[PDB]
Amino acid sequence: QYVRIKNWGSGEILHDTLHHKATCLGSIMNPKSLTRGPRDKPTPLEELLPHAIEFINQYYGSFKEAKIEEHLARLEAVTKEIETTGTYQLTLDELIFATKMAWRNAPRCIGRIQWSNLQVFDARNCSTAQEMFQHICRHILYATNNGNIRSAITVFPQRSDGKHDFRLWNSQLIRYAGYQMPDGTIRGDAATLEFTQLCIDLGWKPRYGRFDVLPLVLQADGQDPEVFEIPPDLVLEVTMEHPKYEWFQELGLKWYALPAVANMLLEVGGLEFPACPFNGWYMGTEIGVRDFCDTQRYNILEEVGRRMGLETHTLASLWKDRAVTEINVAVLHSFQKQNVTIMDHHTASESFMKHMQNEYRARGGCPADWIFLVPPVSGSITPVFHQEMLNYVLSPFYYYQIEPWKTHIWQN
Amino acid sequence: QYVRIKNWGSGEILHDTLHHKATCLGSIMNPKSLTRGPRDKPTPLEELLPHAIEFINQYYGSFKEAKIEEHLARLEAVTKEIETTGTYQLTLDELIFATKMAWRNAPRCIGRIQWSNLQVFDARNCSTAQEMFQHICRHILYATNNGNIRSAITVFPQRSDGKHDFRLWNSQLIRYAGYQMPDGTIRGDAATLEFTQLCIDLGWKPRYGRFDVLPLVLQADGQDPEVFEIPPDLVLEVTMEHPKYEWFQELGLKWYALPAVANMLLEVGGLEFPACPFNGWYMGTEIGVRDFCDTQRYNILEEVGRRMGLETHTLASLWKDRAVTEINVAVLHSFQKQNVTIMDHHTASESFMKHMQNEYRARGGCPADWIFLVPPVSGSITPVFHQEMLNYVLSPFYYYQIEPWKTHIWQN
Numbered sequence: 004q005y006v007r008i009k010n011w012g013s014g015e016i017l018h019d020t021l022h023h024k025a026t027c028l029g030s031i032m033n034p035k036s037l038t039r040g041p042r043d044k045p046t047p048l049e050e051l052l053p054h055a056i057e058f059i060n061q062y063y064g065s066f067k068e069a070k071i072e073e074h075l076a077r078l079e080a081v082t083k084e085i086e087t088t089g090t091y092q093l094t095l096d097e098l099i100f101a102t103k104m105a106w107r108n109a110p111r112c113i114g115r116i117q118w119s120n121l122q123v124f125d126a127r128n129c130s131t132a133q134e135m136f137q138h139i140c141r142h143i144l145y146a147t148n149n150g151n152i153r154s155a156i157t158v159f160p161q162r163s164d165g166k167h168d169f170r171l172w173n174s175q176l177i178r179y180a181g182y183q184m185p186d187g188t189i190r191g192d193a194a195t196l197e198f199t200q201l202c203i204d205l206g207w208k209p210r211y212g213r214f215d216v217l218p219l220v221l222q223a224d225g226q227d228p229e230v231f232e233i234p235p236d237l238v239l240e241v242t243m244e245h246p247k248y249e250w251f252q253e254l255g256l257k258w259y260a261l262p263a264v265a266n267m268l269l270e271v272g273g274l275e276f277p278a279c280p281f282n283g284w285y286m287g288t289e290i291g292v293r294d295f296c297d298t299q300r301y302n303i304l305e306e307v308g309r310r311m312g313l314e315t316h317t318l319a320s321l322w323k324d325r326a327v328t329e330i331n332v333a334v335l336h337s338f339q340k341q342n343v344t345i346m347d348h349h350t351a352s353e354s355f356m357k358h359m360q361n362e363y364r365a366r367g368g369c370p371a372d373w374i375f376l377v378p379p380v381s382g383s384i385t386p387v388f389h390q391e392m393l394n395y396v397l398s399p400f401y402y403y404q405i406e407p408w409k410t411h412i413w414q415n
Numbered sequence: 416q417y418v419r420i421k422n423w424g425s426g427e428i429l430h431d432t433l434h435h436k437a438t439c440l441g442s443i444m445n446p447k448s449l450t451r452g453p454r455d456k457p458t459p460l461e462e463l464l465p466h467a468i469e470f471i472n473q474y475y476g477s478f479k480e481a482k483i484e485e486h487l488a489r490l491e492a493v494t495k496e497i498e499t500t501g502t503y504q505l506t507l508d509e510l511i512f513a514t515k516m517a518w519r520n521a522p523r524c525i526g527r528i529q530w531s532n533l534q535v536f537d538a539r540n541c542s543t544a545q546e547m548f549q550h551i552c553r554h555i556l557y558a559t560n561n562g563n564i565r566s567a568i569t570v571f572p573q574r575s576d577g578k579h580d581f582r583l584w585n586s587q588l589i590r591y592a593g594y595q596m597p598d599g600t601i602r603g604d605a606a607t608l609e610f611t612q613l614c615i616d617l618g619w620k621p622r623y624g625r626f627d628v629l630p631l632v633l634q635a636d637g638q639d640p641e642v643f644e645i646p647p648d649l650v651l652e653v654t655m656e657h658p659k660y661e662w663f664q665e666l667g668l669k670w671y672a673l674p675a676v677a678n679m680l681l682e683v684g685g686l687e688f689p690a691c692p693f694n695g696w697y698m699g700t701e702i703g704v705r706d707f708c709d710t711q712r713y714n715i716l717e718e719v720g721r722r723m724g725l726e727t728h729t730l731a732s733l734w735k736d737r738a739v740t741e742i743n744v745a746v747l748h749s750f751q752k753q754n755v756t757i758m759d760h761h762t763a764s765e766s767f768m769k770h771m772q773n774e775y776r777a778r779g780g781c782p783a784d785w786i787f788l789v790p791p792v793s794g795s796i797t798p799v800f801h802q803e804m805l806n807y808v809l810s811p812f813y814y815y816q817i818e819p820w821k822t823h824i825w826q827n
């Protein structure tokens with residue numbers, strides 16, 4: 004009938020019935036069930052048609068007051084389109100609905116309470132890399148909005164036969180470079196070494212800085228990828244300052260204000276969109292905890308420890324807990340001072356609890372990946388830690404993709 | 416062939432081959448796959464015999480130098496025993512091996528590096544509740560060891576037909592009571608209200624204190640449960656003090672030094688042990704984060720906030736992070752000062768990483784439940800957060816059980 008969900012915090016019980024519409028490996032980052040690979044032939048008509056019917060029904064069933072004539076007309080028009088062309092085109096309104104629903108169906112997203120507030124940029128008419136670059140620049144500019152961040156998504160042309168895919172080779176729109184120095188040390192974001200090297204190989208000019216924004220590596224209509232530098236006037240950054248420790252700014256840190264996922268695939272009604280970058284606004288712990296404190300990233304934890312005068316040689320002193328918290332305070336304080344939208348993890352978790360609650364009333368479910376929803380620091384202090392969650396893959400949905408460099412056939 | 420495991424911290428790769436010997440719901444606390452319920456008929460001989468053979472082979476295969484004659488003799492002797500009695504008895508040495516292996520196969524345990532260091536108390540000859548009480552007292556006394564905590568387990572008689580089960584009704588050996596006061600407020604451990612009431616119903620005398628140790632509710636040979644008070648001289652406690660904030664002790668807090676799970680079932684070679692309490696030593700965050708900071712427990716977070724002079728009215732101030740850390744420092748400092756064994760979560764996580772590493776070399780696997788292994792605070796700061804893990808149920812194994820009060824048929 005349904006699955007029982009319990010909130011060990013408030014003792015509340017939820018009944019999950021939404022999992023029935025889904026299509027021990029838990030701590031796997033990129034599992035196959037969350038990936039949607041490439042193809043070299045169109046989507047079989049016997050598979051496409053049913054999925055399209057399902058979607059058209061979902062879309063029309065969401066209206067406050069049903070419009071049956073249009074519903075039938077659309078189902079019929081879509082079928083005829085599939086019969087005559089082997090694929091079909093979504094109406095702008097259907098695309099909008101799809102992007103929000105896909106967001107809404109993202110197990111790993113904690114900001115889903117904002118699901119209905121999303122700007123959609125229709126770039127399905129695109130043809131060249133230069134044109135992709137232009138759309139991406141518009142997106143970056145729109146979303147940044149002088150610090151008052153706005154969530155948006157740019158939808159490029161859908162996969163046709165699978166040989167003319169549009170793909171952003173970057174993981175995010177804005178991301179810093181990582182360089183292996185001559186003296187053996189690493190500079191910048193150590194996690195981007197191979198990709199930085201890739202850009203260098205394609206002609207990009209390395210500036211060997213600590214915070215050099217990487218170029219957009221665009222691939223359009225199956226063509227080989229072209230490199231484009233992001234116009235510095237478009238990249239808004241925040242200078243890190245601590246509200247008490249003046250020595251903090253001496254660390255010379257900063258971070259970009261725009262969190263935008265660039266390499267995911269949007270699946271809707273049998274249609275696949277290999278290129279559709281999107282963004283929301285940052286949750287403080289992503290920068291404060293992941294970017295700055297991961298040993299495989301900027302790794303600033305120990306230096307902030309010494310600066311604070313902590314006993315960085317005794318783990319039981321809980322110095323790491325003391326440091327990470329100050330770094331997080333610096334991040335939040337800095338964004339707040341530069342008037343750049345940002346949300347702390349505590350407020351974020353509460354917001355999601357409200358969302359999950361709204362979702363179960365509205366449709367009897369909310370796909371949730373606990374491992375991703377629980378913040379990287381102070382987990383049990385947040386309500387999300389005490390919430391039992393079901394993790395299933397609905398549709399529409401945003402899937403991961405096999406890295407483009409691993410399956411791309413180079414022409415020149 | 417095997418499953419690939421990746422450590423996103425060091426980039427290392429492990430090959431899991433151990434999962435083949437196993438018998439999306441992830442964030443479920445007490446799933447059926449981890450529970451072993453009651454029965455009213457013996458274990459079918461066609462099921463028992465194979466499991467027994469498997470175990471005897473495992474046990475004999477673990478010796479540095481195989482002793483084949485004994486191996487054959489044992490297999491044969493065990494079969495004859497099963498044929499003639501319908502069950503069988505493990506040798507003390509086999510029991511020891513079973514308890515350690517079960518520990519070793521506990522997905523949710525972070526202290527598994529200590530797996531081979533375990534004291535085993537053989538109480539399989541027990542008959543009455545008074546006798547269980549005596550064994551439990553010996554265990555508590557042995558394990559506490561004046562603060563220098565020792566890991567131990569007391570094994571009571573195995574399930575025969577399922578109608579003469581030995582069961583400790585408590586979740587832990589030492590645990591504080593929770594009382595609903597006349598003025599509506601809760602006193603003590605709010606999580607133990609029903610159980611405290613149960614004890615009261617069975618004759619126990621409520622002292623309405625904040626830290627009253629609950630009585631042992633023992634059930635022996637299927638008989639109705641008898642209540643027994645734990646001798647105060649046996650319960651070692653630690654008074655909470657902060658190394659800087661003198662107002663900390665004014666909070667009048669303390670906690671027991673002995674973490675002992677009392678209600679789990681030990682499964683080995685087809686045999687089931689419904690009563691086998693065990694203990695290790697505390698990991699600081701269990702008390703500092705779970706006991707003191709859970710809203711459904713002692714809920715001291717806000718008071719510690721005000722005392723610190725923090726802005727407890729603004730979540731973005733990260734006051735909760737500041738508080739919880741001081742509480743954790745108080746806990747660790749207090750145990751260290753009273754000479755009571757304890758391990759901080761940072762050291763704990765490192766220790767487990769070493770264990771997991773040792774396990775993959777030794778047997779190509781280590782069952783791990785990420786959701787439980789990652790500490791309640793500062794997750795990504797610990798190496799465990801960046802480790803991909805496989806969660807499977809091997810054998811021997813410690814299972815959960817349906818609450819005794821839910822399936823017990825009362826006699827008087």
Ligand code: HEM
Nearest residue numbers: 106109111112113114117154155281282283284285286401
């Ligand atoms: C408005 C503010 C938003 C906030 C604060 C938020 C926050 C987050 C966070 C904290 C993550 C985890 C990132 C990581 O650790 O890798 C995430 C993941 C994700 N978000 Fe959101 N989000 C927001 C908006 C959006 C929007 C607008 C979309 C898409 C239309 C979305 C789609 C996703 C998806 C698909 C993931 C999974 C990405 C992955 O698995 O790597 N989110 N989000």
Ligand code: HEM
Nearest residue numbers: 518521523524525526529566567693694695696697698813
């Ligand atoms: C020597 C020190 C040890 C440490 C520091 C340690 C620590 C822990 C911790 C932190 C948990 C999670 C508790 C919770 O949040 O519910 C746990 C669970 C567990 N431990 Fe260990 N442990 C130790 C020894 C042992 C021993 C001696 C055994 C058994 C022979 C064992 C068996 C288990 C089992 C079965 C669980 C799962 C309990 C549950 O799911 O509620 N551990 N341990």
Ligand SMILES: CCCCCCCCO[C@@H]1O[C@H](CO)[C@@H](O)[C@H](O)[C@H]1O
Nearest residue numbers: 056060063064065069070071074078
């Ligand atoms: C073979 C394909 C058959 C498709 C049958 C579609 C029937 C119409 O479907 C209906 O649409 C309404 C909105 O217009 C919704 O409110 C109803 O819940 C839904 O059942």
Ligand SMILES: CCCCCCCCO[C@@H]1O[C@H](CO)[C@@H](O)[C@H](O)[C@H]1O
Nearest residue numbers: 468472475476477481482483486490
């Ligand atoms: C029907 C039951 C058949 C059981 C066959 C058991 C064969 C013995 O089993 C052997 O025992 C040795 C230790 O003595 C181990 O070292 C070997 O790996 C193991 O194969």
Ligand SMILES: C[C@H](O)[C@H](O)[C@H]1CNc2nc(N)[nH]c(=O)c2N1
Nearest residue numbers: 030031032374375800801802803
């Ligand atoms: C191995 C594990 O899946 C990995 O470390 C995870 C854990 N939880 C996460 N949670 C979020 N939000 N983001 C992440 O990248 C990760 N990574």
Ligand SMILES: C[C@H](O)[C@H](O)[C@H]1CNc2nc(N)[nH]c(=O)c2N1
Nearest residue numbers: 388389390391442443444786787
């Ligand atoms: C719902 C979720 O399973 C529950 O809150 C968990 C999370 N992780 C945990 N981890 C540990 N170690 N102990 C716990 O009790 C829990 N409880």
